[PDB]
Amino acid sequence: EQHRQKHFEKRRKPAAELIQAAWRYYATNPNRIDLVATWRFYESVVDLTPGLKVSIRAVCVMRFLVSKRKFKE
Amino acid sequence: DQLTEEQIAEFKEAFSLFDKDGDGTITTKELGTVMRSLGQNPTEAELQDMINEVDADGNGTIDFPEFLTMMARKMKDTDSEEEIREAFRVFDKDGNGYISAAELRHVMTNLGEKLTDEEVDEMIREADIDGDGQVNYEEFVQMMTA
Numbered sequence: 646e647q648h649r650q651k652h653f654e655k656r657r658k659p660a661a662e663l664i665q666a667a668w669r670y671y672a673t674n675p676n677r678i679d680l681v682a683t684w685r686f687y688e689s690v691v692d693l694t695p696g697l698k699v700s701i702r703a704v705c706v707m708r709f710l711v712s713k714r715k716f717k718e
Numbered sequence: 719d720q721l722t723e724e725q726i727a728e729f730k731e732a733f734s735l736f737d738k739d740g741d742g743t744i745t746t747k748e749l750g751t752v753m754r755s756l757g758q759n760p761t762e763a764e765l766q767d768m769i770n771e772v773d774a775d776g777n778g779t780i781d782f783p784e785f786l787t788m789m790a791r792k793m794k795d796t797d798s799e800e801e802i803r804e805a806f807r808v809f810d811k812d813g814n815g816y817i818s819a820a821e822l823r824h825v826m827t828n829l830g831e832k833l834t835d836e837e838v839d840e841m842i843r844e845a846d847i848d849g850d851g852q853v854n855y856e857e858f859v860q861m862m863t864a
């Protein structure tokens with residue numbers, strides 16, 4: 646019975662992390678200033694920006710590329 | 719036409735935030751220093767993995783051209799539609815092509831690099847176009863990657 650159950654267990658964490666990184670990549674797009682929650686997340690752990698925002702973007706791009714890699718492994 | 723003069727300047731400014739010693743390359747140590755100021759605590763291996771994705775010439779660090787290459791790229795140009803759709807499919811256990819907002823929040827806020835409830839709210843609003851509480855994730859991934 647637990648056929649696809651063990652396989653789900655193996656893929657769930659890299660699947661979630663790819664979705665999360667992909668969303669944070671999408672939601673820090675500078676042409677979508679309505680998307681604020683991912684910035685508020687980072688803001689709650691660092692106070693304004695401006696060049697700090699691009700570095701967050703860089704961190705999000707890199708975390709997405711890594712999580713894409715890990716998902717295909 | 720993709721990159722403007724002003725965008726390039728912004729990315730050169732960002733590069734200097736990472737390249738602390740000003741030697742033209744970002745090391746794992748320098749990337750670790752930036753991420754700790756952003757609230758994260760990655761391991762050396764995790765830092766290495768991040769650089770490995772950006773370090774085109776394989777010399778172990780990121781130079782400005784490698785940084786600009788990465789930052790000029792849109793998610794649409796990473797050819798990721800199949801992987802991201804496969805990742806959502808993992809959570810569509812029944813396979814009907816929909817994941818409820820409640821299921822997505824449950825997973826996104828309790829597994830992996832947990833999203834805040836606000837971030838999931840933003841994701842749901844972006845994805846659940848028709849407001850029925852069910853996310854058609856194929857349509858969502860299409861829009862994020864096309």
Ligand SMILES: [Ca+2]
Pocket residue numbers: 736737738739740741742743744745748
């Ligand atoms: Ca340096």
Ligand SMILES: [Ca+2]
Pocket residue numbers: 773774775776777778779780781784
């Ligand atoms: Ca390099």
Ligand SMILES: [Ca+2]
Pocket residue numbers: 810811812813814815816817818
């Ligand atoms: Ca379903």
Ligand SMILES: [Ca+2]
Pocket residue numbers: 845846847848849850851852853854
């Ligand atoms: Ca819907």
Ligand SMILES: [Ca+2]
Pocket residue numbers: 857860
């Ligand atoms: Ca479609």
